[PDB]
Amino acid sequence: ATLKDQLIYNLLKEEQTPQNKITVVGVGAVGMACAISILMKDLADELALVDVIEDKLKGEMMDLQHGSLFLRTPKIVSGKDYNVTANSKLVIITAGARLNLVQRNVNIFKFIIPNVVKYSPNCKLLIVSNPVDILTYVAWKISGFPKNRVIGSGCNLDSARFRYLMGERLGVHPLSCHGWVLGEHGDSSVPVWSGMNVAGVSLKTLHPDLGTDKDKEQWKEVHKQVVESAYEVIKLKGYTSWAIGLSVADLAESIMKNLRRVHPVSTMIKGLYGIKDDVFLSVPCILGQNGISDLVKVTLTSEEEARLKKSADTLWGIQKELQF
Amino acid sequence: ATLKDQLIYNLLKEEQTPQNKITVVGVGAVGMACAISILMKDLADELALVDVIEDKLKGEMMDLQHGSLFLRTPKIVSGKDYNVTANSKLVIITAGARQQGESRLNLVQRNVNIFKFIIPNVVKYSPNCKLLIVSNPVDILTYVAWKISGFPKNRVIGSGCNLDSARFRYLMGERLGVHPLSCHGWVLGEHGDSSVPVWSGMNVAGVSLKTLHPDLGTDKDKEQWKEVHKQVVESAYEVIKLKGYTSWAIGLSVADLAESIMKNLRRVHPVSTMIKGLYGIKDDVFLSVPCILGQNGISDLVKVTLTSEEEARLKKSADTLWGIQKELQF
Amino acid sequence: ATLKDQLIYNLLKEEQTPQNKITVVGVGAVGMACAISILMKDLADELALVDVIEDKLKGEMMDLQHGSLFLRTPKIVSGKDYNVTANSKLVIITAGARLNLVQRNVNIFKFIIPNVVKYSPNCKLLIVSNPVDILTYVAWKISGFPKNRVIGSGCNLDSARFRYLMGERLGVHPLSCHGWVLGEHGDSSVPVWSGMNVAGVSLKTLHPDLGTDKDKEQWKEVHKQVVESAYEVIKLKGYTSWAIGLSVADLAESIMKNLRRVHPVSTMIKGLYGIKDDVFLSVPCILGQNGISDLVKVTLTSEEEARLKKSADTLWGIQKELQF
Amino acid sequence: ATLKDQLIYNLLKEEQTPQNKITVVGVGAVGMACAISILMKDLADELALVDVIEDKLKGEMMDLQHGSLFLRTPKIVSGKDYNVTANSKLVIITAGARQSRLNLVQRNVNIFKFIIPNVVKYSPNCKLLIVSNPVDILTYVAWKISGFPKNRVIGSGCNLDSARFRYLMGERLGVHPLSCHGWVLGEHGDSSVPVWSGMNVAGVSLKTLHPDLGTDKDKEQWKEVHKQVVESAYEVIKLKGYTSWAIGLSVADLAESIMKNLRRVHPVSTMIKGLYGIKDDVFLSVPCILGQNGISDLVKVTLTSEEEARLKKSADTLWGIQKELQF
Numbered sequence A, C: 001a002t003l004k005d006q007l008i009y010n011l012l013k014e015e016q017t018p019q020n021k022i023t024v025v026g027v028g029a030v031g032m033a034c035a036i037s038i039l040m041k042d043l044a045d046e047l048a049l050v051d052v053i054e055d056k057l058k059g060e061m062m063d064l065q066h067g068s069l070f071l072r073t074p075k076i077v078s079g080k081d082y083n084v085t086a087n088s089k090l091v092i093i094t095a096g097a098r099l100n101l102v103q104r105n106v107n108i109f110k111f112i113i114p115n116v117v118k119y120s121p122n123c124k125l126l127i128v129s130n131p132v133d134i135l136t137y138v139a140w141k142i143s144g145f146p147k148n149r150v151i152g153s154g155c156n157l158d159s160a161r162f163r164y165l166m167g168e169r170l171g172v173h174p175l176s177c178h179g180w181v182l183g184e185h186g187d188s189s190v191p192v193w194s195g196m197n198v199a200g201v202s203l204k205t206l207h208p209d210l211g212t213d214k215d216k217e218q219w220k221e222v223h224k225q226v227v228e229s230a231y232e233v234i235k236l237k238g239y240t241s242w243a244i245g246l247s248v249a250d251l252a253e254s255i256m257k258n259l260r261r262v263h264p265v266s267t268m269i270k271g272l273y274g275i276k277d278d279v280f281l282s283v284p285c286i287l288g289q290n291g292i293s294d295l296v297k298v299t300l301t302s303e304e305e306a307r308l309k310k311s312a313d314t315l316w317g318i319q320k321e322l323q324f
Numbered sequence B: 001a002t003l004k005d006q007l008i009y010n011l012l013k014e015e016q017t018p019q020n021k022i023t024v025v026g027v028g029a030v031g032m033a034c035a036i037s038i039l040m041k042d043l044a045d046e047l048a049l050v051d052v053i054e055d056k057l058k059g060e061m062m063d064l065q066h067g068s069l070f071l072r073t074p075k076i077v078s079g080k081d082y083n084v085t086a087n088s089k090l091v092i093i094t095a096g097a098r099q100q101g102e103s104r105l106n107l108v109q110r111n112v113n114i115f116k117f118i119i120p121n122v123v124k125y126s127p128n129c130k131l132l133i134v135s136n137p138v139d140i141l142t143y144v145a146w147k148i149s150g151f152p153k154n155r156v157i158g159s160g161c162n163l164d165s166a167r168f169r170y171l172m173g174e175r176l177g178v179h180p181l182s183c184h185g186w187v188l189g190e191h192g193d194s195s196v197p198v199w200s201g202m203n204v205a206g207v208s209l210k211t212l213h214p215d216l217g218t219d220k221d222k223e224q225w226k227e228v229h230k231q232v233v234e235s236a237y238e239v240i241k242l243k244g245y246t247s248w249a250i251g252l253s254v255a256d257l258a259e260s261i262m263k264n265l266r267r268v269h270p271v272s273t274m275i276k277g278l279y280g281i282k283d284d285v286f287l288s289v290p291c292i293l294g295q296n297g298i299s300d301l302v303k304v305t306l307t308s309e310e311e312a313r314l315k316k317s318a319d320t321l322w323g324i325q326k327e328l329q330f
Numbered sequence D: 001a002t003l004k005d006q007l008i009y010n011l012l013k014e015e016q017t018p019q020n021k022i023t024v025v026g027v028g029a030v031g032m033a034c035a036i037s038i039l040m041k042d043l044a045d046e047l048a049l050v051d052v053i054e055d056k057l058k059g060e061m062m063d064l065q066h067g068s069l070f071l072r073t074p075k076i077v078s079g080k081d082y083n084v085t086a087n088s089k090l091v092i093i094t095a096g097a098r099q100s101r102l103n104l105v106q107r108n109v110n111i112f113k114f115i116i117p118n119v120v121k122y123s124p125n126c127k128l129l130i131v132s133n134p135v136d137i138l139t140y141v142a143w144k145i146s147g148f149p150k151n152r153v154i155g156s157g158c159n160l161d162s163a164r165f166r167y168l169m170g171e172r173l174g175v176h177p178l179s180c181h182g183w184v185l186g187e188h189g190d191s192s193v194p195v196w197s198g199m200n201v202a203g204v205s206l207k208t209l210h211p212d213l214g215t216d217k218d219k220e221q222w223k224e225v226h227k228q229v230v231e232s233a234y235e236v237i238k239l240k241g242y243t244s245w246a247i248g249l250s251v252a253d254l255a256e257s258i259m260k261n262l263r264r265v266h267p268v269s270t271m272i273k274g275l276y277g278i279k280d281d282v283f284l285s286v287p288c289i290l291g292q293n294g295i296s297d298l299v300k301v302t303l304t305s306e307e308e309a310r311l312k313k314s315a316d317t318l319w320g321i322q323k324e325l326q327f
């Protein structure tokens, strides 16, 4: 007659599978920022963590667990073995180590993806690890999931940084500053000037020289600052964490709560802008409980299409040379 | 005109003084976990960050700012200068660099020295703020914050046993298969190794565990519930061994205190306060008891009936702390 | 091609079922208060409303729908026909008359409960309609559900009001004021004085007269004022809504997110306190994804135990005369 | 000693002036919906309720207070006397009672003549958020009676109109209303203007994709989406007898920008003199930046000639009513 048995009468031991489980793969600075943002948004009833460094993994798990009083996620687990990830709705891959980088990371996915698939055959994959557009393709390929269930973080953070910088210029909350950065994540991303607006007032229409060499106000600087800010953050603190974690949590929210909000994420663009290769790039997608159910067909200028087409060529050039 | 002027007509450019500003001093692992938890709880309309390492400081600020789309804290600032902290309602001190293997005395003297410059700068720019001390040793450093600031007792709060208690309830919830929220239990006194678990208060739904199980908390306990408090101490060392530091649990616990304070909730939390006049304690020491927290900081405290042995452990901590504190120079 | 097909490319069209659906039966003052609170707590991805008054029902649905921009519940439906309630995790019954009260609400349930079960066989039932302890038994009896999946709102509001009044006297937030009102909802509930505490400090130990007539401070009136308050709110306002909505939403949060928090709700207490009859009364219960998995065995004084057994006799006396 | 004093030692006997206080004037269906939504969004540390029906007011206060355990707003107060409203940051006016119009007007002006001065006396530094109808006119009336600068007098205006529109838009497109952008401006209600040029998803102009958007020759008749916005309002009233939830939610959204100084852009009613050839003191909805000082800025929407003419017509009609009011 334990104290537990004296205190509590059990009606059923009928344990059941977690209903809204999320797994993060890789407990580096990016993965843990994703984890804490996810925990604080009450998106999962069970959170699983996986990594190859066993000590760091257990220690992060316990540190999260010790915050359980202040959370609404009743079960947090971790392990190197992927059985802990079983029955995840969403699995978020951040594992890496900050063309060498590709095959290096391709070998890693060859282990991770099949294990993820093994234990959550019907999950959505959200790839954050870089190069994210290539690695989203790699995951799509290895897992054999339909295109809707393999999502890259893509230009989600790029766009968010853009909207912050735009809001600073205008003196307006980023929520009310709209603008899309599409295509290849990072250096070669495309700011779609035609979609930039506040309250439906297109900045292109008011300012027809927007984002061109002529522009007297040099709004191209804003997109340049998006990439410059990324290098400056790494220069200053060594890594990026908070912003990517907050943006991934926002994607997870749409997926887990089947919101059908639209986000700039990396999806297979074969069939658009004259691209015929099996490659992934960022366009606005509708996110929900089976991942990317729909995408928005943004009208690009000839110069913008050309930039996406060049990225798709560069990326297929790397991908045809890959060993699976 | 410029594009901004063509787009937006300005009605006025007046005023602009923060209504719910929080400052965090020290942007290490603890500081930044406090910052992100505070931001995701929509507690502040402005967050200020302060450190001595200028590069790190600026990059941490930027990193938070780039997540602005996903938050409702419209202004994040940072700087080595305390002018960025002006008009803070709450100022959280997580500065000092964590202990290696170094001792308490070495930690004490280095962090006392750090506070001698931090605290007056905080007081200058935010004379009416509540101060929340997290840096270790927390009970001593809360005293130090109080002595230097000249603040009344209600506005100097030490994180104290708030994390100890959170871990205790976590562990208690594990053994019982109940959410920590519904497992009640208080760890009081000196933060860390010497903390006191108050067995008589441990309950679920108002049912005293001690009443059900009289051996609870004793050596004669066949179920060794006394290990639950031991594991609170053990789990802390273990986390530090495994990942090198602690961040998430302390950050979450601190954001909870900040919530009570900023929203004037008058919830009861176990935090360190100036305890002179209780438990036959006569010296100026800060220890954790259950404190009502709100917009004036600690407005009231709960008088917990302690056992002879629990009273003795607190008095012992008070004697030891004061022994250190009398030999400090200001 | 339509504008939609011009703007949006579909990957997959097949309609997925809701992951976290809740139904509210009865769109009166209580039902809609439950709904708004549930909606502002982000507990459901689908909300279904049912009533017999078709106009009021449609209008209430539309009114919620028109607030969709400010919510995170992407689908809101209504109907007199229970097919709109299909696949609910949780079904909350607030339909009824605001002995005669019993028989006529029993006749309503003979139609409601089978229809609920038909379309959501694995749902948790949460009963709010009065008299709640009797009607919870009625719902259990008719549904054929196991007892863990039939939950009466019970003493959850009574305890919430008790903690509010306690907080006012002590000048402490009700969250930090702990105290349990158990047994039969309403006039015959039992305040468990031994459990009343702040920070683990027993009020009864500090103030032995607590809950007796000898008490100079009349702490016994705190429990009486719980009952007086209910009647007073009705006199002043005509009904109660907000408090009960909020309390139901809190129960729903533990159920839907599997929190395993303890709440005072109505459950089958046969086998406890000498009770032999098939009756439902409030004890502290652990709430999660399977409804009530466990029960806290509160130590009650001789008088408290007898008060509970008395209620059980009274409730069975009524129950045995009912026609199903 | 008392139980409280044996349990609790007091360090200071309080009490600060209220720091994040909101008052709601009028505890009808709309005001109580505003109240619950504000409470569930943790926007205030003190909520004050005012009305002229004593019993109802006291009963609503108690009902809310009884849910305190589940809220984070530690002080909820009410009264017919406006001393209970002292030091509010934001005062929300939903007083009047449900419906001619000029009847509703001069009737509600008589009400405002008592309400507004009382509000001003106890919170001279508050922002006013007017919800009561006709909202554009009644926002003008609160502005004039108060003597407040125009930045602190905000009308709910076309906020609800724009949210209904976005709901309808999202229903058509199979997208969440958050990702469906579109603005309904001008006079709240029957005469509101859908700005077809701003209507977009992901910055893709639906007008650019479909130049017939919002026109008569539109083969998909997207004009009906605006008509449905107005038809929706009549339908709700017919079906349930009043509107509450949606307006409450939208108002709470405005309160959040204001109390948290977010500087988000919302379609609210503001003094529009000097724009679109409007020369009178009239309040019409345009996109406004909302923060701790109310409306600090407004967005200059480029309107078609027909859009501008509709705003001008509302302005003339509104001014013609306003000029005749007795204060």
Ligand SMILES: NC(=O)C1=CN([C@@H]2O[C@H](COP(=O)(O)OP(=O)(O)OC[C@H]3O[C@@H](n4cnc5c(N)ncnc54)[C@H](O)[C@@H]3O)[C@@H](O)[C@H]2O)C=CC1
Residues within 6 Å of the ligand: A025, A026, A027, A028, A029, A030, A031, A050, A051, A052, A053, A094, A095, A096, A097, A098, A108, A111, A112, A128, A129, A130, A131, A132, A153, A154, A157, A158, A185, A239, A240, A244
């Ligand atoms: N798409 C975007 O917007 C962003 C992408 N990223 C990417 O996130 C990735 C990680 O970033 P950091 O956390 O800063 O690196 P990190 O070095 O701090 O952490 C990486 C983690 O991956 C783990 N790991 C390595 N191999 C593994 C394996 N086979 N299985 C499981 N875990 C394994 C490591 O143990 C380590 O904990 C990088 O690829 C980085 O480029 C970074 C931020 C922005």
Ligand SMILES: NC(=O)[C@@H]1C=CCN([C@@H]2O[C@H](COP(=O)(O)OP(=O)(O)OC[C@H]3O[C@@H](n4cnc5c(N)ncnc54)[C@H](O)[C@@H]3O)[C@@H](O)[C@H]2O)C1
Residues within 6 Å of the ligand: B025, B026, B027, B028, B029, B030, B031, B050, B051, B052, B053, B094, B095, B096, B097, B098, B099, B114, B118, B134, B135, B136, B137, B138, B159, B160, B163, B164, B191, B245, B246, B250
């Ligand atoms: N009370 C509790 O339960 C706590 C649980 C965890 C940690 N607690 C303490 O937080 C502090 C800080 O922990 P952390 O892990 O964040 O230390 P770091 O070394 O990583 O970071 C410290 C920062 O402190 C900064 N620092 C250092 N000096 C200064 C000055 N003079 N002003 C401002 N900031 C300063 C320094 O640059 C670092 O950025 C340490 O005393 C821990 O024992 C206490």
Ligand SMILES: NC(=O)[C@@H]1C=CCN([C@@H]2O[C@H](COP(=O)(O)OP(=O)(O)OC[C@H]3O[C@@H](n4cnc5c(N)ncnc54)[C@H](O)[C@@H]3O)[C@@H](O)[C@H]2O)C1
Residues within 6 Å of the ligand: C025, C026, C027, C028, C029, C030, C031, C050, C051, C052, C053, C094, C095, C096, C097, C098, C108, C111, C112, C128, C129, C130, C131, C132, C153, C154, C157, C158, C185, C239, C240, C244
């Ligand atoms: N358990 C608690 O703590 C409670 C606190 C407050 C209310 N409690 C009870 O909720 C119910 C409902 O109270 P409410 O104030 O909401 O009554 P209303 O009259 O406003 O609404 C009842 C609705 O119930 C509808 N109704 C009536 N019959 C039906 C059927 N057969 N199916 C569906 N809906 C039905 C009817 O049309 C109304 O719309 C009643 O038994 C109250 O005693 C008890």
Ligand SMILES: NC(=O)[C@@H]1C=CCN([C@@H]2O[C@H](COP(=O)(O)OP(=O)(O)OC[C@H]3O[C@@H](n4cnc5c(N)ncnc54)[C@H](O)[C@@H]3O)[C@@H](O)[C@H]2O)C1
Residues within 6 Å of the ligand: D025, D026, D027, D028, D029, D030, D031, D050, D051, D052, D053, D094, D095, D096, D097, D098, D099, D111, D114, D115, D131, D132, D133, D134, D135, D156, D157, D160, D161, D188, D242, D243, D247
């Ligand atoms: N702007 C929008 O989009 C709105 C959409 C919905 C409704 N909107 C208006 O809110 C108000 C109130 O609507 P509601 O439906 O709540 O009317 P009620 O009759 O139920 O409530 C009115 C309350 O107003 C009170 N009242 C009446 N007079 C007073 C005075 N003088 N002081 C304080 N309170 C007063 C009265 O006693 C009632 O309690 C009305 O003008 C509606 O057209 C506007």
Ligand SMILES: O=C1N[C@@](c2ccsc2)(c2cccc(O)c2)CC(O)=C1Sc1ccccc1Cl
Residues within 6 Å of the ligand: A098, A130, A157, A158, A161, A185, A186, A187, A226, A227, A228, A230, A231, A233, A234, A238, A239, A240
């Ligand atoms: O923000 C980051 N930091 C990384 C980076 C920064 C500059 S180039 C790559 C990065 C690099 C190394 C380590 C690390 O943790 C992150 C990884 C990454 O993809 C990003 S987002 C980014 C990067 C470049 C341009 C624009 C953007 Cl929006």
Ligand SMILES: O=C1N[C@@](c2ccsc2)(c2cccc(O)c2)CC(O)=C1Sc1ccccc1Cl
Residues within 6 Å of the ligand: B098, B099, B100, B136, B163, B164, B165, B167, B191, B192, B193, B232, B233, B234, B236, B237, B239, B240, B244, B245, B246
């Ligand atoms: O959890 C922690 N980690 C620290 C620690 C852990 C064991 S002893 C001190 C710590 C130590 C060293 C570096 C560092 O960053 C933190 C600092 C600290 O106070 C705590 S909380 C703690 C510590 C000991 C016993 C019980 C508790 Cl609830």
Ligand SMILES: O=C1N[C@@](c2ccsc2)(c2cccc(O)c2)CC(O)=C1Sc1ccccc1Cl
Residues within 6 Å of the ligand: C029, C030, C098, C130, C157, C158, C161, C185, C186, C187, C226, C227, C228, C230, C231, C233, C234, C238, C239, C240, C241
């Ligand atoms: O608070 C209420 N109001 C009702 C009531 C009130 C007095 S007796 C029954 C009620 C009555 C009529 C309409 C309605 O919506 C609710 C229904 C009900 O159960 C409650 S809770 C209650 C009722 C009596 C004593 C104690 C409590 Cl905690």
Ligand SMILES: O=C1N[C@@](c2ccsc2)(c2cccc(O)c2)CC(O)=C1Sc1ccccc1Cl
Residues within 6 Å of the ligand: D098, D099, D133, D160, D161, D164, D188, D189, D190, D229, D230, D231, D233, D234, D236, D237, D241, D242, D243
């Ligand atoms: O939604 C409502 N209901 C009211 C209404 C409806 C049709 S005309 C006025 C209304 C009317 C009567 C009573 C009442 O409580 C509300 C009050 C009101 O302003 C609105 S919003 C509205 C009204 C007309 C067209 C478009 C909109 Cl977005």
